[PDB]
């Protein structure tokens, strides 16, 4: 039912992940100030496709491949997750 | 050193006697476990300590090629006594 | 739980199960299969034997090193039984005879010996006890053997509860006394049957099934106060069963009726023998009473064995009796027996 | 990628030989159930034949199939003749080996293996 | 009680302070009726109605990849970043330090030989302590 | 004069190197890497298309009357992709000399048979097949020799375990000699013995 | 003539091994580490291929370490990593690789033991 964990996956150097790094440095502090009790896990690796996982009440997870996605589109998909 | 256990079995120089709940006592029924009475700890302790004159000596087993490799033992200490590694013969100097 | 009775291995020879077992009728016909199925998965099997060492050789194998311990005993003499069950978890009574002797009657086989064994088992402190009665075991039966076996089944509960009492039908196997017994009626040029075999029903079972059943019951956390009916499938009518025997053994078939009193006298004078008799009064009686409909009780499939039909394993038993001109004949040329339900 | 053949241009020319081999085995089984006094039925023998064929039905390289045909022809030689015995013939059925479980929980109950 | 296995007795990942994931390799199998840990959890689940999706270890490594893929990358440190955001985000909260010192608990070698269950159960560590305190 | 070490010759080395030049320049289509060891032994290495012509040549030529096959072997080397290094040991009886012919193979790259040249090679090729799995073309029988009849595997490969995969014992339930999966009362104690010190710098594999 | 087999090379049906020790078994390809009791490095320099160890138990008679798997002491030797990867893919086994580990080259100097300013001035000999 309710949202329990989000977690983001990305790379530090593959440009398909750019827009996620910019989104982090732009909106992460704002998002955490808006959701100070929610955990949201940012884990970066070398060469993988970005993802965004949404952990609901039971073991119910939802992925969306936000590869080569501008930061505004990242934030739109993320608000779709939050709502 | 052939003390027995409360179960009634004999005990080896390697304290090994099967526990009372171990099913592997069946093999000793109408039978017996081979355990040696002549222990080496007791029998090497039942030997004197060889006073010597020097501070370094040499121990073969006693037969030359029938003993063990010729090693050398220091005897500078007086808190204790020297001791061979192959055999267990002890030494001292005065 | 001692550290040595912890099961290890991939479930085979040279492994461990924790099934230290005293098997008292091991020198027989069911006990050899029991010991085989125990050693096949790794388990110590104490085997008390009174016979000569020549007749324990086939049991000397069927187990890895040190897992088969034989020790001599005597039913008359206690302290030859405590000595056996002194270190065991399980005890499996298979003792039984198809005739009395000067030294041992049926009471002193099915009643007093299980009572002593179970007393020793309770005093030693073992966890289980597998008694083997008969399916027809009833205090109101016709045979001394069956009444004695019901009395033993009751007295074993009275002494050692938390027990397992298996009640098989008449078992068939390579060296049985059921199919071989009916097939050895060729040496007489005609076979007698009470009422021509009708009004009699037989639900035989195979040795491997009973053996696997015992060998799982010694590990099942269930089956502590449960009786079992090791019957097998395909209830058979005696005339058709003997016809199938004498078709698979391709000799001939000359049936004819015979009353029970003259056939009983025949069994008596055959049992007049110092050696292993061919026939006995109690054997005739046990042959000519039907097997109970066993569906009031669990059976094999409640224990982890799918029963085997007679038609698939009988040739292994019956090809011994064939002649040349028929020894090289297959299972699918005997127009199988006619089953009944009743 | 551009390798040599053995007895095969590609897979259909090899499945031809495979079916020939199945043919020989199907024709041979009733003779072996009779010669050596097997205590089984002709149906389950041919079922074992089809089973031991299907154990290698996942393969596509023609060279593998050709070597398997060769091995099967060797086994068929040994079985047409009575070089081998009731023992080696009944060794396919696994009549003593308890069935290896394919469930997680039984494996967990006995053993540390998967 | 559900007996598990030790680092000598299970292939397992253990991430260090750096972040390097590192795979153990099974040396000896665990004793008695003791088993691997994820194995016990999945068996529990199957006894319940959950029945977690994975049956083997490689599937569990795929799951670890789904959660945190820094873990399958054995002996592969990965450059992290984004400390300035944590700085901005911790500068907000106002929790004050105490005017009280900080001694670590491992103040001497006497407190080094016994730090966990395995070291607590050890004749050699106890001999070392008996030697250090005397 | 050195009593502990072996005495060395010169003429045999020169002879066999000259004969290696001979075989090389006379049979170039098939030949690779002719070599002569420290101890006097010639060793020719061959493309598998050259087995029958090379063996017939050394059998039937006048300066090379190698008309007696001593061995036909194989050596499993999992490193090289073509694992099996198949060998032929031949002697002359006219010049009192031996020679070695070598070629390579794989599980799926068989070799022409040789029974048309040396009838001795029938059972040897059957053995190589039984032990390594190297099929041989136009061989008369080519069935196992040494292994059991219902045997699955090629033992002398390095990827086959020493103790095998099956084990035998007689079961009273079935009255046969059943084959069961391997289970040892004592595991074979493998030992690590190779010292970590270069004893032979001449064979120093460089990096 | 030649043949167009593009799919992967597979040999599992030819080796005649069972399914258990093909699918269940896991392989570790590695260059063996140096035994730190010795400064010798020749037992390195070759790649190897081990299998996952399995249950070893004590025979109740004598205490001997028993096994049910025959690949307990299976150890092979390759001169390159490509060859071991090829062999494991060929025999249907699943592998896990440990990339090579070389010691760093270090600037050794005996005169640094006798420095004027640095802390390398060792006090013994
Ligand atoms: N057809 C069958 O076999 C059926 C059997 N059963 C039951 O199955 C059990 C075993 O059947 P089965 O295996 O055929 O029995 P067997 O006659 O085949 O062998 C039974 C064992 O009992 C031992 N035994 C018999 N009398 C004595 C005695 N007086 N003192 C000591 N030991 C004795 C024998 O030892 P030795 O031979 O060395 O004297 C023998 O090993 C019996 O309890 C029987 O009631 C039930 C239904 C069918
Ligand atoms: Zn000495």
Q: Are C291 and C135 in contact (CB under 8 A)?
A: yes
Count of CB contacts below 8 A, C vs G?
A: 26
Q: Are C173 and C206 in contact (CB under 8 A)?
A: yes
C-alpha separations of F58 from B10, C143, F136 in Å = 75, 89, 21
Name the helix (H) or strand (E) containing C19.
none
For chain D, say whether F149 makes contact (Cβ under 8 Å).
Answer: yes
Ligand nearest to the CA of B90: 2
* Residue G27 to residue G4: CA distance in whole angstroms: 30
Q: Specify the DSSP class assigned to residue G35.
A: -
Tell me which residue has tokens 């696997």.
C212
CA atoms within 13 A on the CB side of G63: 1
User: Helix C310-318 vs helix C238-248: angle between axes, to the nearest 10 degrees?
Assistant: 50
* Residue C180 to residue C317: CA distance in whole angstroms: 8
* Residue C7 to residue B81: CA distance in whole angstroms: 50
- CA triplet C108, C110, C116: central angle to 5 degrees? 70
For chain E, say whether C10 makes contact (Cβ under 8 Å).
Answer: no
- Tell me the shortest Cα–Cα distance from G69 to chain F, in angstroms: 7
* Residue C267 to residue D17: CA distance in whole angstroms: 64
Ligand nearest to the CA of C143: 1
The reply to whether residue F79 touches residue G40, judged by beta carbons under 8 angstroms, is no
Q: How many domains does chain B have?
A: 1
* Residue E62 to residue E52: CA distance in whole angstroms: 13
* Residue F43 to residue F23: CA distance in whole angstroms: 11
Mutation pick for ligand 1 pocket among C95, C228, C291 (CB with most ligand atoms within 8 Å): C95
G72 → closest Cβ in F153, F187, F198: F187
* Residue A63 to residue C224: CA distance in whole angstroms: 53
Sign of CA dihedral F193, F196, F200, F202: positive
Nearest residue of C to residue G69 by CA position?
C10
Q: Are D69 and D18 in contact (CB under 8 A)?
A: yes
DSSP string, C204-252: -EEHHHHHHHHHHHTT-SS-SS-EE----S--EEHHHHHHHHHHHS-S-
* Residue D104 to residue E111: CA distance in whole angstroms: 44
Ligand 1: centre distance to CA C60 (Å)? 19
Which among D67, G50, G80 has a CA at the least distance from the CA of F161?
G50
Q: Give the CA-trace dihedral at E69, E75, E76, E77, to 10 degrees.
A: 100
* Residue F48 to residue C292: CA distance in whole angstroms: 75
From chain C, the residues in CB contact with D33 under 8 A are: 330
- Tell me the shortest Cα–Cα distance from E32 to chain C, in angstroms: 6
Q: Are F34 and F24 in contact (CB under 8 A)?
A: yes
* Residue C46 to residue C26: CA distance in whole angstroms: 9
Tell me which residue has tokens 């009549």.
D95
* Residue D90 to residue C52: CA distance in whole angstroms: 34
- CA triplet C199, C203, C204: central angle to 5 degrees? 130
β-strands F31-36, F42-46 pairing:
antiparallel
CB atoms within 10 A of CB C132: 28
Q: Chains contacting A with at least 3 CB pairs below 8 Å?
A: E
Q: Specify the DSSP class assigned to residue C5.
A: G
- Residue C341 token pair: 């339900």
From chain C, the residues in CB contact with B19 under 8 A are: 2
Residues facing C47 on adjacent strands: C70
From chain D, the residues in CB contact with E39 under 8 A are: 108
Strands (E) across F55-117 are located at 68-73, 85-91, 98-104, 111-112
Ligand nearest to the CA of B69: 2
From chain C, the residues in CB contact with D42 under 8 A are: 330, 332
For chain D, say whether E43 makes contact (Cβ under 8 Å).
Answer: yes
Ligand 2: centre distance to CA B88 (Å)? 6
Ligand nearest to the CA of C134: 1
Residue nearest to atom 19 of ligand 1 (CA): C28
Method used to determine the 3D structure = cryo-EM
Tell me which residues of chain D have a C-beta less than 8 Å from any C-beta of chain F.
3-4, 6, 61, 63-64, 67, 70, 74-75, 77-78, 83-84, 86-92, 95-97
Ligand 2: centre distance to CA C178 (Å)? 74
* Residue C227 to residue C167: CA distance in whole angstroms: 7
CB atoms within 10 A of CB F72: 22
Ligand 1: centre distance to CA G115 (Å)? 95
From chain F, the residues in CB contact with D75 under 8 A are: 150
- Residue C122 token pair: 């309770």
Residue nearest to atom 24 of ligand 1 (CA): C95
Q: Which residues form the pocket of ligand 1, taking CB atoms under 6 Å from any ligand atom?
A: C 25, 27-31, 50-51, 75, 94-97, 104, 109, 132, 134, 168, 170-171, 176-178
E110 backbone dihedrals φ, ψ, rounded to 5°: -60, -30
Q: Specify the DSSP class assigned to residue C274.
A: S
For chain E, say whether A9 makes contact (Cβ under 8 Å).
Answer: yes
Domain borders along chain D are 1-114
CB atoms within 10 A of CB C278: 14
Domain that holds residue B15: 1-94
Name the helix (H) or strand (E) containing C159.
helix C144-159
Domain borders along chain A are 1-83
For chain E, say whether D9 makes contact (Cβ under 8 Å).
Answer: no
- Residue F64 token pair: 């090379």
Ligand 1: centre distance to CA B37 (Å)? 45
Residues facing B91 on adjacent strands: B50, B82
E19 backbone dihedrals φ, ψ, rounded to 5°: 115, 0
Interface of E with G in 27-56 (CB under 8 A): 27-29
- Residue D39 token pair: 């205590």
Burial pattern C232-256, b for ≥16 Cβ within 10 A else e, equals bbbbbbbbbbbbbbbbbbbbebebe
Ligand 1: centre distance to CA F124 (Å)? 56
Name the helix (H) or strand (E) containing F137.
strand F136-137
- Residue G55 token pair: 């249950």
For chain F, say whether C311 makes contact (Cβ under 8 Å).
Answer: no
Which among A67, A33, A70 has a CA at the least distance from the CA of A47?
A67
* Residue C331 to residue G25: CA distance in whole angstroms: 42
For chain C, say whether E33 makes contact (Cβ under 8 Å).
Answer: yes
Name the helix (H) or strand (E) containing G27.
strand G26-30
Residue ranges with CB less than 5 Å from ion ligand 2:
B 59, 84, 86-87
Q: Specify the DSSP class assigned to residue G34.
A: P
Which among F93, F99, F90, F87 has a CA at the least distance from the CA of F15?
F99
Residue nearest to atom 28 of ligand 1 (CA): C109
Sign of CA dihedral E75, E79, E84, E86: negative
The reply to whether residue D92 touches residue F150, judged by beta carbons under 8 angstroms, is yes
Sheet holding B50-52, edge to edge: B50-52, B90-93, B82-83
């Amino acid at each position: 039912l309710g949202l329990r964990e989000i977690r983001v996956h990305l790379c530090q150097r593959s440009p398909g992940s750019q827009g996620v790094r910019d989104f982090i440095v732009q909106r992460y502090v704002e998002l955490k100030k808006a959701h100070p009790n929610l955990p949201i896990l940012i884990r970066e690796c070398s060469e993988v496709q970005p993802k965004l996982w949404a952990r609901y009440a039971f073991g119910q997870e939802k992925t969306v491949s936000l590869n080569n996605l501008s930061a505004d589109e990242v934030t739109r998909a993320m608000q779709n997750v939050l709502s | 050193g052939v003390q027995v256990s409360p179960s009634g079995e004999k005990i080896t120089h390697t304290g090994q006697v099967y526990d009372e709940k171990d099913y592997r006592r069946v093999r000793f029924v109408d039978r017996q476990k081979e355990v040696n009475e002549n222990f080496a700890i007791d029998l090497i302790a039942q030997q004197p300590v060889n006073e010597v004159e020097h501070r370094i000596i040499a121990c073969d087993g006693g037969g030359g090629a029938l003993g063990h490799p010729k090693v050398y033992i220091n005897l500078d200490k007086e808190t204790k006594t020297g001791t061979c590694g192959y055999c267990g013969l002890q030494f001292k100097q005065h | 739980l001692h550290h040595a009775v912890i099961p290890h291995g991939k479930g085979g020879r040279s492994s461990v199960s924790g099934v230290v077992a005293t098997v008292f009728g091991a020198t027989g016909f069911l006990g050899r299969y029991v010991v085989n199925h125990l050693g096949r998965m790794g388990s110590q099997v104490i085997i008390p034997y009174r016979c000569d060492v020549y007749d324990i050789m086939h049991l000397r194998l069927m187990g890895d090193l040190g897992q088969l311990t034989f020790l001599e005993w005597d039913a008359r003499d206690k302290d030859s039984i405590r000595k056996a069950v002194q270190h065991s978890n399980v005890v499996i009574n298979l003792i039984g005879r198809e005739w009395e002797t000067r030294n041992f009657d049926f009471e002193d086989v099915f009643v007093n010996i299980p009572r002593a064994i179970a007393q020793a088992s309770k005093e030693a402190g073992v966890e289980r006890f597998i008694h083997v009665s008969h399916l027809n075991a009833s205090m109101k039966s016709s045979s001394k053997s069956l009444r004695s076996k019901a009395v033993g089944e009751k007295e074993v509960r009275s002494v050692f509860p938390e027990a397992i009492i298996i009640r098989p039908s008449d078992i068939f196997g390579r060296e049985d006394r059921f199919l071989n017994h009916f097939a050895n009626y060729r040496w007489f040029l005609a076979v007698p049957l009470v009422s021509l075999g009708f009004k009699t029903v037989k639900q035989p079972v195979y040795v491997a099934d009973v053996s696997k059943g015992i060998v799982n019951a010694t590990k099942d956390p269930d089956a502590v106060g449960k009786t079992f009916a090791f019957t097998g499938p395909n209830r058979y009518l005696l005339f058709h069963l003997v016809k199938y025997i004498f078709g698979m053994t391709h000799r001939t078939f000359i049936p004819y009726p015979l009353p029970l009193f003259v056939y009983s006298w025949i069994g008596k004078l055959f049992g007049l023998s110092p050696f292993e008799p061919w026939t006995t009064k109690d054997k005739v009686e046990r042959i000519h009473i039907s097997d109970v409909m066993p569906t009031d009780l669990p059976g094999l499939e409640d224990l982890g064995v799918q029963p085997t039909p007679l038609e698939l394993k009988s040739i292994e038993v019956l090809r011994r009796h064939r002649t040349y001109r028929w020894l090289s004949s297959e299972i699918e040329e005997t127009k199988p027996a006619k089953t009944v339900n009743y | 990628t551009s390798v040599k053949p053995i007895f095969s241009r590609d897979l259909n020319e090899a499945k031809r030989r495979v079916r020939e081999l199945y043919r020989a085995w199907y024709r041979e089984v009733p003779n072996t159930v009779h010669l050596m006094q097997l205590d089984i039925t002709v149906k389950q023998g041919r079922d074992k034949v089809r089973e031991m064929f299907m154990k290698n039905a996942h393969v596509t390289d023609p060279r593998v199939v050709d070597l398997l045909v060769i091995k099967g022809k060797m086994e068929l030689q040994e079985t047409i003749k009575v070089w081998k015995q009731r023992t080696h013939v009944m060794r396919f059925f696994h009549e003593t080996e308890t069935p290896r479980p394919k469930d997680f929980l039984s494996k967990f109950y006995m053993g540390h293996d998967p | 009680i559900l007996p598990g296995a030790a680092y000598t007795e299970k292939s397992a990942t253990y991430v260090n302070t750096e972040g390097r994931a590192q795979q153990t390799k099974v040396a000896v199998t665990p004793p008695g009726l003791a088993r691997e840990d994820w194995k016990i959890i999945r068996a529990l689940s199957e006894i319940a109605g959950i029945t977690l999706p994975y049956d083997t270890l490689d599937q569990v490594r795929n799951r670890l990849e789904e959660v945190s893929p820094n873990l399958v990358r054995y002996d592969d440190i990965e450059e992290t970043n984004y400390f300035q955001q944590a700085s901005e985000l911790a500068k907000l909260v106002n929790q004050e330090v105490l005017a009280d010192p900080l001694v670590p608990p491992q103040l001497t070698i006497k407190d080094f030989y016994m730090t966990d269950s395995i070291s607590r159960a050890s004749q050699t560590m106890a001999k070392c302590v008996k030697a250090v305190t005397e | 004069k050195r009593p502990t070490v072996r005495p060395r010759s010169d003429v045999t080395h020169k002879q066999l190197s000259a004969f290696g030049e001979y075989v090389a320049e006379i049979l170039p289509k098939y030949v690779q890497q002719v070599q002569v060891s420290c101890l006097d032994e010639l060793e020719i290495c061959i493309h598998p298309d050259g087995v029958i012509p090379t063996l017939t040549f050394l059998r039937d030529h006048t300066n090379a009357q190698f008309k007696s096959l001593a061995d036909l072997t194989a050596v499993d080397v999992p490193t090289r992709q073509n694992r099996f290094e198949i060998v032929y040991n031949l002697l002359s009886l006219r010049f009192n000399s031996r020679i070695r012919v070598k070629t390579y193979a794989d599980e799926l790259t068989p070799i022409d048979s040789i029974v048309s040249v040396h009838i001795a090679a029938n059972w040897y090729e059957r053995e190589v097949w039984d032990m390594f799995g190297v099929f041989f073309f136009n061989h008369p029988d080519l069935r196992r020799i040494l292994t059991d009849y219902g045997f699955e595997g090629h033992p002398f490969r390095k990827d086959f375990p020493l103790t095998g995969y099956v084990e035998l014992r007689y079961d009273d339930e079935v009255k046969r000699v059943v084959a069961e999966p391997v289970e040892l009362a004592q595991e074979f104690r493998k030992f690590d013995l190779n010292s970590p010190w270069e004893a032979f710098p001449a064979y120093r594999q460089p990096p | 003539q030649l043949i167009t087999v593009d799919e992967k090379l597979d040999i599992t049906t030819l080796t005649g091994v069972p399914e258990e020790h093909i699918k269940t078994r896991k392989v570790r390809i590695f260059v063996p580490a140096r035994n730190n009791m010795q400064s010798g490095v020749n037992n390195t320099k070759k790649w190897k291929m081990e299998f996952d160890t399995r249950e070893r138990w004590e025979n109740p008679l004598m205490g001997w370490a028993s096994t049910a798997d025959p690949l307990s002491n299976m150890v092979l030797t390759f001169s390159a990593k490509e060859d071991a990867i090829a062999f494991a893919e060929k025999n249907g086994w699943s592998y896990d690789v440990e990339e090579k580990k070389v010691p760093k080259p270090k600037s050794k100097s005996y005169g640094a033991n006798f420095s004027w300013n640095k802390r390398t001035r060792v006090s013994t000999k």
